[PDB]
Design a protein around this ligand. Structure first.
Ligand SMILES: CCCCCCCCCCCCCCCCCCCC(=O)O[C@H](COC(=O)CCCCCCCCCCCCCC)COP(=O)(O)OCCN
Ligand SMILES: *[C@@H]1O[C@H](CO)[C@@H](O[C@@H]2O[C@H](CO)[C@@H](O)[C@H](O)[C@H]2NC(C)=O)[C@H](O)[C@H]1NC(C)=O
Ligand SMILES: *[C@@H]1O[C@H](CO[C@@H]2O[C@@H](C)[C@@H](O)[C@@H](O)[C@@H]2O)[C@@H](O)[C@H](O)[C@H]1NC(C)=O
Length: 168
């Protein structure tokens, strides 16, 4: 298939300080690397697939995503008390056959599947059998707002797909 996969590992020492490590692969080729603390994260395209204006917008959007991602983790901790240190893994992307696209967004915590995005209804589901205040609250937050439902679905089904179509 024609695919863009994105992987984000987030190392939280505490609610306020996170180290990001991640990357993206297009057609099985490493294309982007993400690394560093939340206050000065480095994001590069390894090959200049996007021109500067397009790349600047993409970088701005990624940074906005990280701000939202970190804000959500802080909120869950604030309301339900997370155990630190912890690592979060987000694995997401889109896959185009040789019109329709398969998209996915899976979240794991400390290496165990936690929640994932079901794009059919733009809803997050529990990926664990373990019941907890944390999973219920996180799902409630993720499912309460357009930004984490339909806006994320647009990113996967439109932004990601058009990126694969333009650059593969
Ligand atoms: C494409 C071009 C190439 C990309 C290069 C990538 C570099 C490598 C790293 C990959 C990082 C993934 C980035 C995803 C960006 C998604 C994005 O921009 O979404 C925007 C809004 O989504 C949101 O705001 C959704 C927030 C989702 C958070 C999910 C995490 C759930 C778990 C958090 C709490 C866990 C608590 C228990 C520990 C809309 O983007 P737009 O610009 O189209 O608008
Ligand atoms: C994620 O895993 C880390 C260990 O890698 C957990 O941290 C441990 O938490 C227990 C209980 O609070 C402490 O006794 C240990 O000292 C901690 N380890 C370290 C290295 O500090 C953390 O609680 C886990 N977080 C989850 C499961 O959400
Ligand atoms: C990212 O930032 C790291 C931390 O910055 C340091 O701490 C802050 C609080 C300020 O005192 C600042 O002046 C310090 O430099 C750096 O250690 C690291 O090198 C930075 N990464 C890059 C790529 O610049």
């Amino acid at each position: 298939l024609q695919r863009l996969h994105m992987l984000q590992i987030s190392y939280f020492r505490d609610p306020y300080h996170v180290w990001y490590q991640g990357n993206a692969s297009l057609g099985g080729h490493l294309t982007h690397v993400l690394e560093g603390p939340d206050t000065n994260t480095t994001i590069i395209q390894l090959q200049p697939l996007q021109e500067p204006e397009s790349w600047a917008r993409t970088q701005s959007g990624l940074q906005s995503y990280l701000l939202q991602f970190h804000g959500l983790v802080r909120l869950v901790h604030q309301e339900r008390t997370l155990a630190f240190p912890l690592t979060i893994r987000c694995f997401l992307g889109c896959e185009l056959p040789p019109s329709r696209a398969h998209v996915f967004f899976e979240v794991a915590v400390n290496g165990s599947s936690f929640v994932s995005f079901r794009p059919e209804r733009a809803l997050w589901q529990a990926d664990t059998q373990v019941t907890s205040g944390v999973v219920t609250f996180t799902l409630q937050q993720l499912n309460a707002y357009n930004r984490t439902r339909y806006e994320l679905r647009e990113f996967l089904e439109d932004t990601c797909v058009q990126y694969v179509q333009k650059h593969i």
